[PDB]
Swiss-Prot record, chains A, B, C, D, E, F, G, H:
<comment type="similarity">
    <text>Belongs to the UbiX/PAD1 family.</text>
</comment>
<dbReference type="InterPro" id="IPR036551">
    <property type="entry name" value="Flavin_trans-like"/>
</dbReference>
<keyword id="KW-0808">Transferase</keyword>
<keyword id="KW-0285">Flavoprotein</keyword>
<feature type="binding site">
    <location>
        <position position="139"/>
    </location>
    <ligand>
        <name>FMN</name>
    </ligand>
</feature>
<comment type="function">
    <text>Flavin prenyltransferase that catalyzes the synthesis of the prenylated FMN cofactor (prenyl-FMN) for 4-hydroxy-3-polyprenylbenzoic acid decarboxylase UbiD. The prenyltransferase is metal-independent and links a dimethylallyl moiety from dimethylallyl monophosphate (DMAP) to the flavin N5 and C6 atoms of FMN.</text>
</comment>
<feature type="binding site">
    <location>
        <begin position="104"/>
        <end position="107"/>
    </location>
    <ligand>
        <name>FMN</name>
    </ligand>
</feature>
<feature type="binding site">
    <location>
        <position position="185"/>
    </location>
    <ligand>
        <name>dimethylallyl phosphate</name>
    </ligand>
</feature>
<feature type="binding site">
    <location>
        <begin position="13"/>
        <end position="15"/>
    </location>
    <ligand>
        <name>FMN</name>
    </ligand>
</feature>
<keyword id="KW-0637">Prenyltransferase</keyword>
<dbReference type="GO" id="GO:0004659">
    <property type="term" value="F:prenyltransferase activity"/>
</dbReference>
<dbReference type="Pfam" id="PF02441">
    <property type="entry name" value="Flavoprotein"/>
</dbReference>
<feature type="binding site">
    <location>
        <position position="169"/>
    </location>
    <ligand>
        <name>dimethylallyl phosphate</name>
    </ligand>
</feature>
<feature type="binding site">
    <location>
        <position position="116"/>
    </location>
    <ligand>
        <name>FMN</name>
    </ligand>
</feature>
<dbReference type="GO" id="GO:0016831">
    <property type="term" value="F:carboxy-lyase activity"/>
</dbReference>
<feature type="binding site">
    <location>
        <position position="39"/>
    </location>
    <ligand>
        <name>FMN</name>
    </ligand>
</feature>
<dbReference type="InterPro" id="IPR004507">
    <property type="entry name" value="UbiX-like"/>
</dbReference>
Length: 207, 207, 207, 207, 207, 207, 207, 207
């Protein structure tokens, strides 16, 4: 396979829960192992914006998502917000790429300042120190200078700041096509195959 | 009325032409005067992503948009890319709020560095020097550090950086609902009434 | 009326609970709507420094303050520290001015770094991104370089840093006169009428 | 009326005394209250460059300017350089917009560094801390890096740096037309009506 | 004794003359030698805000304060604003701790930029270069970014920025108790004994 | 002769075409060789603000200016905006001093960022890299922080930023006297003799 | 002659009055015209450290120094501290090199921040803006970070910071030989001949 | 005793060998233990500028200086330039204050950048990391921006930059009195008694 075998996927409490669930589904379809993390605010966001009845506690959540995505047993690992015994908490862990999708301004802040108040923030801290892939998907508008300064610092350190800003150049017809555009870009960034978003210009030889 | 009587609306060559056309339509419905500017690349974007057959030259374009939006004669002014005799080129002009929607990375760059290679860039330069409202709506992902540095500099100077990043917290059902979310935020930023996006929590008294 | 119709008033755990309660009382007397927030540490401060027996939970607190200030029903809204459904959590809310009085060094830090760990911090983040008024009233001495750097960053972004540093130039006779001096300055900053602190020099025509 | 009711007008010792006197005259014609301040060096500049025989001391000066401009009694207040009992010395004063016209490099420096060695410098310090309008009209050439750094710092803090650099695009025929161009720009900046400088392009609908 | 034998106490023209006089009284009671300096504006502040009839010239002032505080002959030295022959003007002097209480924004500025326009400013310059204690007690609100930048630079260089911001956690009953809180903090900073403000938590062994 | 034998004189599209034409005339009278460059926008400015009927293309322009100024054949060279074969395009050229008068904000920006989109911008880039004289004459008001940052960067690198800000201290009687003041300052900066503006104080021996 | 025909020599209130008087004497012996300025504190320094009975007022001072140095009539011009009609106050003056010897920390500060509170500070401001030579001779120890920051800013702008730090490598036998070392370095910096300090290594051909 | 019991005294290859030898003599007279280090270039400087016939190797050097200063056996320790077994090489050593007198620009550079190419540079690195006193005595003129940047960085970190810049305010009569002035300042900085330089103003009670 091209791309990482294992992805830490963290969902935090920005609007755009559909992006995280769709990414999770695509990662599972590409036979990747997913270490799944979710903040308390992201649970509230998912309750508000989707019809997904996500259980509260990690093992029920794991059973639930494994069924929701059609994953294999053990393919989705779920870890709680203070579970320091999980692989993402230490750089001695097997290497994973990490994506925070969606990324709240509060989680962006914690990662930029090194905060490490829950396992999502610590996992990001580990990714940066180990020079492992870290993709942040912020969903906010306007962006203040505080947001922008935090994104710049992390981009300068090699994190990918991929805002939930879909393009329209493949004539989307539905909300799902817009969600898929952003998910495609994430997968492209990770180097994981996807066929939702064609390769621009691939056919074009001259002019 | 609340908000500005006159808006300079510039469309540049980022994906998201639908945002600009919908904003234009809403401004017209709120009886605002619109000074409309469009880059050569934005004309190509509109051709590619929409079914709008926009004429090339300013007076035909003006006739066209006035009909497309149901505007009054003279309500939409269209100015070409080197028309220095237009109001936006000088700070001695009557005050206008300016929005660049969508804003390409190239136009973001020109505005951040002071470039002033066409009338859109000069108009933004004027807005900043006169301390008139300037809203930029970038559409790009990932954002590089170059993008982020340009957005930060302008945000620090009081421009509003409003990325084309719609939220999902009012359960959008269509592409149009997502377009309207971003347009609503722009209008809110300008202080122009809108009823596409309710006031969050306005009903909520306690808990 | 001059000034904002609605104020988010956050009390955090610095010494100076009397400033917050007096501001609350003045806002109510000027017929403003107050969205009231209070941190867990600020509850402890109020217990220690005042004889106000503030209830713990938001609806009892609301009933209590509405009586304490002589407010109208619904004039004071109280929201808990994780109540994301409250207006201050989103920039799509109706516009409010925000004051954090008193402001602890910890809350100053969170606002400067974008932290957004409770509703006070998120509300401040929203005020900054929406370019709505934000006044911070820090109470600390000495100020370290960490404090000063945090205040500078926020001042440069257009927040008003109004330290709880009363003047003596209108010959205060009591603790209450000093409290009122600072409250007056806050109201002046917000553009809300007050008659506790005269307009300096207003009578003086020459010399 | 549009614009501020009260303006602090400070004249400092740069060449361009005619700009200050013409602004003073226009403010008086627009029925504004003017708190007038003048430095010792600016008195020497006015003696050298104009035929205005300005008295030395504040009450004689006030009597003099009230007659020179055709102002109402009390419309022009004159305050001496150490008169801390004047409104501009305290932020508890009634709000005023402040203009320093012309602004010497020495006064620019004092305002940028926070110096507060006379009432002009203190008044500027107050305007900045209260977020009241502050317009500086420097007259110098070349500008050194020291000048430019001082202007940048103040511009970044929201002061308007309006150099005494008239334009020629309304075909000036006299020294007075050039003086009026700069005065017009100041009034435009303050939001005070003026009809010396037309609104650029106001007639132009297309091309 | 603990703490410095000699303190340079400078009073400058911020509101809060009571803090300086109370500190002076406490230093005298702790048998310290005080080199007392006072600015022209601080003389005006003391006239306005207090009933202390301070003589204008240094020897009469010295006689006056020695009586006002019950000091020993020679215990309070008073030096004029251009007296370069006084100990504080040279780093070859015997070591002293220096406090500027209250500190105006103008004096803060001079010390941060190295100005050295009177003996207070030069004495501060000397303290910094000799790495002798320097405590500044600013009294201002709001603080602008200019103030904050000046305080930060000096804090980074090891000056103590101690704003006149009293706490309420020992239930003050009078203006005097608030004045004493700030004076206590200054003495604590200098390492001089005081019994106005108890040692927080000194009794508390667990929980 | 004192001063440079050859000057590259670039006119760009700021108001103040009269300054460029008067400088050109003075350079010709001082028997200097002038490499003359003019932007497309500056052609429009000259059409609008002056009665000079400047031809469009370089050889007709050259014939025209040689007659307008009374120059010798070959004394004024005119080069088009993409003429890379002209001396100013390479640092291997014979040394010239360069003046951009007037300098638009857009040209200021290009020079500060190194843009090199036409021969004026490239010529400035060459002057800086070769450490040859470069004088910029901006005409704009207000100056934004973007302008000021661009001017500062270039001043720090040894360019002379000479704003079109005439003084009044030699009692100008006409628009021409103000134009001549700025032209005089440019010539002084270049070290070229001029007798329009006397040497200040040259007669004054004492007091 | 090599070097400047005219030197502005400013003496300020640092220890090292002997350096200024010796430089003055050497400039006179090299037939240079000297525009001499002296601060009030430097007058006190000269009284304290030397046996030179310098008169207080500019014309008596001029008569005095012309005799003390054996100068020609008119060769030394003396200008008072507020004499704006003197050549050094304007950049339109004939070009001069400027030396501040000795330079106090207070004058260093004023020049670095652009202060322009007397004619010495303004003259330095003019030298920098006109890119005329400016040499500062500070005498202080230790140097604080404030001093060092001020010297760095001015050095980066092309001022020469020449501390009064004599070398011993030509085996000085007297205080005068040390004074002459520093004076020699100043003259070398200005490009004025001197034969007090030989050219190091001038005889040495190999090894 | 007041002050440190042990001083690391490093001599490097700036002019001013007399300062180092005189400091060494004074430290010995105050019964301090001296860890003496000397660079290869400083040996050449001492040969050139003094009549001291310093032996090359550490034990002969030690015998020599112990006799030259009248020290006790073991009071002066001499360590070679690569002797890592000496106390100054490790922060686990007993605490010492360190002085580099004189300090060359090359040694200043090494200390500012952390170089640690000989035992002098490493000893300074250790002093900084352990927060032990470090005094640098540079002898150079002019100071370039490189020097000044290096001194600033170290001053900001709490090193004392004490340039070899003697004052004249105690009317020196000989080269030795100037050497003693600088040595006095060093001892004052270290807190070691000295009676070469009186305490300025110690007698002065008023005026
Ligand atoms: C429905 C809902 C939508 C939200 N949308 C956003 C959003 O788009 N962006 C954002 O930064 N915060 C948003 N928030 C707020 C955060 O959830 C909040 O600041 C929280 O503290 C983030 O915590 P976390 O980073 O641990 O997930 C939203 C909250 C709710 C309830
Ligand atoms: C179909 C199409 C879509 C594009 N989408 C984007 C985009 O989303 N963001 C962007 O920065 N540039 C995009 N570009 C590229 C720009 O149009 C291009 O860089 C151009 O130079 C911008 O010029 P302008 O700023 O004058 O409009 C797109 C171009 C095309 C043709
Ligand atoms: C009685 C009391 C007084 C306090 N006074 C202050 C104060 O003046 N300034 C401050 O920054 N913190 C003070 N604190 C500490 C804070 O309350 C503490 O750091 C807390 O974490 C702040 O949390 P918050 O910002 O959520 O309110 C005080 C705490 C108590 C109990
Ligand atoms: C006739 C005259 C013209 C002056 N022109 C200027 C000028 O154009 N720009 C400037 O910065 N200073 C100029 N100055 C110098 C200042 O007046 C001087 O630096 C003074 O210290 C400024 O003090 P102030 O800022 O309190 O007015 C001029 C002085 C005189 C006498
Ligand atoms: C009654 C009175 C109260 C003042 N209060 C303050 C104050 O609280 N803070 C401040 O920075 N300046 C205040 N000022 C202004 C200063 O005194 C003024 O800016 C002055 O130039 C400071 O000079 P100094 O630093 O030499 O004392 C006050 C002045 C007066 C007369
Ligand atoms: C009549 C006229 C006057 C102008 N005046 C100015 C001006 O004073 N300052 C400025 O920066 N731009 C001014 N402009 C705008 C510029 O000409 C424009 O931004 C252009 O892109 C500059 O291009 P250039 O730098 O290649 O000349 C003016 C334009 C016109 C037509
Ligand atoms: C005898 C004497 C010696 C002084 N020596 C110095 C000195 O070496 N360095 C210094 O910066 N200030 C020294 N000062 C202090 C200044 O003179 C003082 O800070 C003054 O404000 C400087 O003003 P000026 O820059 O206008 O000359 C000395 C003062 C006196 C009286
Ligand atoms: C006689 C003599 C005098 C010197 N004077 C100085 C001086 O005053 N300042 C300086 O930085 N370097 C001076 N140098 C140069 C240095 O000694 C040289 O740059 C050397 O590399 C410094 O090495 P060090 O730092 O290991 O001692 C002098 C050299 C010699 C021989
Ligand atoms: C949870 C854990 C073992 C953390 C230590 O990880 P690492 O050495 O900091 O990468
Ligand atoms: C097109 C035009 C008249 C530009 C000059 O505008 P401004 O004086 O720079 O605001
Ligand atoms: C609680 C909530 C709906 C947060 C989203 O607000 P916004 O789009 O970030 O201003
Ligand atoms: C002259 C005076 C009362 C200054 C105090 O004003 P403020 O509290 O600093 O705005
Ligand atoms: C007033 C005086 C002797 C100043 C010189 O002091 P220092 O050498 O700069 O500490
Ligand atoms: C037009 C030309 C030959 C450009 C190369 O010039 P240079 O080597 O960059 O100074
Ligand atoms: C004293 C005087 C005429 C100052 C103006 O000089 P310049 O135009 O600022 O160089
Ligand atoms: C020569 C030596 C033992 C160096 C180690 O010292 P340290 O642990 O770095 O202070
Ligand atoms: K959590
Ligand atoms: K274009
Ligand atoms: K909380
Ligand atoms: K004055
Ligand atoms: K004073
Ligand atoms: K062009
Ligand atoms: K003076
Ligand atoms: K060596």
């Amino acid at each position: 396979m091209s791309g990482p075998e294992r992805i830490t996927l963290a969902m935090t409490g920005a609007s755009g829960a559909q992006y995280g669930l769709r990414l999770l589904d695509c990662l599972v379809q590409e036979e990747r192992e997913v270490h799944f993390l979710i903040s308390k605010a992201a649970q509230l966001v998912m309750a508000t914006e989707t019809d997904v009845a996500l259980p509260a506690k990690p093992q029920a959540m794991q059973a639930f998502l494994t069924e929701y995505c059609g994953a294999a047993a053990g393919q989705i690992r779920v870890f709680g917000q203070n579970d320091w015994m999980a692989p993402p908490a230490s750089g001695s862990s097997a290497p994973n790429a990490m994506v925070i999708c969606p990324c709240s301004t509060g989680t962006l802040s914690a990662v930029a300042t090194g905060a490490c108040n829950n396992l999502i923030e610590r996992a990001a801290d580990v990714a940066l120190k180990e020079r492992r892939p870290l993709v942040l998907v912020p969903r906010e508008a306007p962006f203040s200078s505080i947001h922008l300064e935090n994104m710049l610092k992390l981009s300068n350190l090699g994190a990918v700041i991929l805002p939930a800003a879909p393009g329209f150049f493949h004539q989307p017809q539905s909300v799902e096509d817009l969600v898929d555009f952003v998910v495609a870009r994430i997968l492209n960034t990770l180097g994981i195959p996807q066929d939702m978003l064609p390769r621009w210009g691939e056919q074009h030889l001259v002019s």
